[PDB]
Design a protein around this ligand. Sequence first.
Ligand SMILES: *[C@@H]1O[C@H](CO)[C@@H](O[C@@H]2O[C@H](CO)[C@@H](O[C@@H]3O[C@H](CO[C@H]4O[C@H](CO)[C@@H](O)[C@H](O)[C@@H]4O)[C@@H](O)[C@H](O[C@H]4O[C@H](CO)[C@@H](O)[C@H](O)[C@@H]4O)[C@@H]3O)[C@H](O)[C@H]2NC(C)=O)[C@H](O)[C@H]1NC(C)=O
Ligand code: QEM
Ligand code: NAG
Ligand code: NAG
Ligand code: NAG
Ligand code: NA
Lengths: 355, 356
Amino acid sequence: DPKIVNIGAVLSTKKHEQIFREAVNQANKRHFTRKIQLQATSVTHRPNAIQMALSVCEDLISSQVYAILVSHPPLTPTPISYTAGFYRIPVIGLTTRMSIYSDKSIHLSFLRTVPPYSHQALVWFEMMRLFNWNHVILIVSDDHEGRAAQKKLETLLEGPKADKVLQFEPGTKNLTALLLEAKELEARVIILSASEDDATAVYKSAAMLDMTGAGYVWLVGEREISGSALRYAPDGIIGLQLINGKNESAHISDAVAVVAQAIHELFEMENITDPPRGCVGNTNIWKTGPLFKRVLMSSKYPDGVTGRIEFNEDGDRKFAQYSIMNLQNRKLVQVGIFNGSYIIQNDRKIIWPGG
Amino acid sequence: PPSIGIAVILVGTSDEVAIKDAHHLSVVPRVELVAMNETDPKSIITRICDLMSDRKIQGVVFADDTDQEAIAQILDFISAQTLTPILGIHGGSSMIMADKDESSMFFQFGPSIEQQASVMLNIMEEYDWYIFSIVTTYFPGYQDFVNKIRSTIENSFVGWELEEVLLLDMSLDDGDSKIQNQLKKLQSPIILLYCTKEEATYIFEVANSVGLTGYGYTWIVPSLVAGDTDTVPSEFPTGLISVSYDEWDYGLPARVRDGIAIITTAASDMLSEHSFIPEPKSSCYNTHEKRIYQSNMLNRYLINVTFEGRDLSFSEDGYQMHPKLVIILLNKERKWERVGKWKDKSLQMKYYVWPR
Ligand SMILES: *[C@@H]1O[C@H](CO)[C@@H](O[C@@H]2O[C@H](CO)[C@@H](O[C@@H]3O[C@H](CO[C@H]4O[C@H](CO)[C@@H](O)[C@H](O)[C@@H]4O)[C@@H](O)[C@H](O[C@H]4O[C@H](CO)[C@@H](O)[C@H](O)[C@@H]4O)[C@@H]3O)[C@H](O)[C@H]2NC(C)=O)[C@H](O)[C@H]1NC(C)=O
Ligand SMILES: C[C@@H](CN1CCC(Cc2ccccc2)CC1)[C@@H](O)c1ccc(O)cc1
Ligand SMILES: *[C@@H]1O[C@H](CO)[C@@H](O)[C@H](O)[C@H]1NC(C)=O
Ligand SMILES: *[C@H]1O[C@H](CO)[C@@H](O)[C@H](O)[C@H]1NC(C)=O
Ligand SMILES: *[C@H]1O[C@H](CO)[C@@H](O)[C@H](O)[C@H]1NC(C)=O
Ligand code: NA
């Protein structure tokens, strides 16, 4: 008999639960499990965030889970980061891309197998090196996510410089003011960060001002060319898609893989205590938690279904891979990929705006 | 006059007697004292969700006897999801909480990080201690703390000199001695330290092992580190200065008194200017459904309340407007001695020459 460690997961559907259950089973198979053996413990999302937090306590933490995997539903992963964060149990984000979770100050024990939206800057950057755009205007929504991306890009710029950053109040519908302020500048590469609904707002104003014409470059992210945002998106726009970034299944398989390796690496050390069984009455952090985060946080899984798994200082995926997208004749057309480090331009030619 | 339910959750050993001992407005308070044994998330969420179904509670006054700042956070959560006002009047419930939700209605007694750090500089001026360094963890508020310091230093014709500023990572362990290395780099008489009580016990334990607790080294820390004064961790250096909510002058039943004051007064004001006061949630198990039917129109009022001749008003970030502060000094017998009082924006010290 070996020691049973539990990993837990909060997933979208009972089909995905089954996938998690089977991922662990294969880890058990793949690994030497004489001393420690994994067990899978999962639930699906709850209707509101209080019921969710509690579910964590009753269903997961009650089983002394060393980790909790978290996807989305079919209501964020926050009540899960907190409840679990309360004890310093590591929480692994499977599909959330918001930049809030990159903040160690409120989501301390959080890491994810996907990068935050703001990391798209790394690509826009290799992109400015490639097509020699040295002068850009950056237009971001004045929300956390907006500033996150602005912060991220300015870091890399200190080559090519940023002429002005125009920040706008999210939810606004008539941006003609903001846009005309940008029209006056000599620079014609524009980088946008905004939600779907704010993408839409910019895209329109951008048109009625004749700035989506030829001689303009529009470089954006995934949110800015998804769903509603596409209905009014100007042709010649370049945007990104996080490859596999929405395959819950792909990410369950890989998270479990990394976690099972960390769990084994961990028990190579000593003075490893179990997490607290249950919430009620326990108010001390799990002593071994901060170590276990350290062991995960510097794990490396190289032949992973979602590619090369590896986390930065903030616990965010590194070497994430992006499809480079071009809106051509109103079709999203793949013109290349960012493969973690390099841009690789495929045969399909980029039609800029105007062209 | 109609009756609004006000629950008062007093955690840990407390005298329900004087509490129940200590109001002609436009509406009356139907108070009900409740004790609670535990302070983890499932306990606190559950106790409050239950109480909210049994009765119709429009307010909550929370007091506890611990040093768990996570209680302040658990509450802010609870407060925002259910849209119920909650007052953390004493304890962990009262510790500095930075960046509370937008939707919250959670207010705490005691001074904001920005204010304490102000207080910490007035002291350093009294004794012409102008040379100092900062050390913080990633605890929420740490940014408000450093930034409040800076814009003061920056905008001052006084000869301040911020020598270094260290940010320590407690998310990860210290089996590599990363912290130790950082700390070893400090070389200033004063060291403002922003982090949590449990965080600080560990930091000092390390700071000692680099000769930084001795004389020549003075550490100033905020309320949440002093925490509760009848508890002094063994690794707290003697000579340690700290601000503190005057649990001396201003004790519990007085706090529970104004507790019930603010929630009642604020209710009155809103039945007056609007001929209605928002219905209390019947259940937390139904927050998605009943959301368009709820709001924080009471904040307008929970803030600006005058009572018994005192402005018991709150700020935006949800901390008290002008609380009475004591400045305390950890002495040679490892007990906390009061050594100064903070009133308006005026600081009065007991000593002219600083003690050893
Ligand atoms: C994303 O895309 C990038 C770019 O293509 C890939 O990275 C390169 O990967 C290749 C293949 O692994 C690396 O190749 C090997 O390069 C060696 C020498 O390198 C130098 O010179 C180049 C050109 O300037 C520089 O880029 C690089 O920094 C070095 O200075 C060779 O000696 C290798 O040869 C030996 O092995 C090969 C097989 O791999 C045999 O064919 C040979 O006979 C010989 O035994 C080899 O060609 C390359 O160095 C990488 N470049 C950089 C800069 O990273 C990534 O792999 C890809 N990433 C993902 C996630 O897919
Ligand atoms: C602030 C805490 C996070 N914190 C602990 C309490 C928890 C409260 C809560 C639990 C369950 C439901 C609702 C609310 C929410 C998460 C952590 O990031 C941290 C610790 C130490 C540090 O130097 C910096 C950051
Ligand atoms: C809570 O604990 C105290 C002390 O043990 C006890 O008096 C009280 O009965 C307990 N509460 C419950 C659930 O009965
Ligand atoms: C993603 O999920 C798994 C990855 O292991 C794979 O079997 C499947 O084909 C993929 N599906 C999609 C949406 O590409
Ligand atoms: C709150 O009420 C007071 C007293 O009635 C009054 O002076 C003022 O209008 C209000 N205060 C604020 C914050 O406007
Ligand atoms: Na993180």
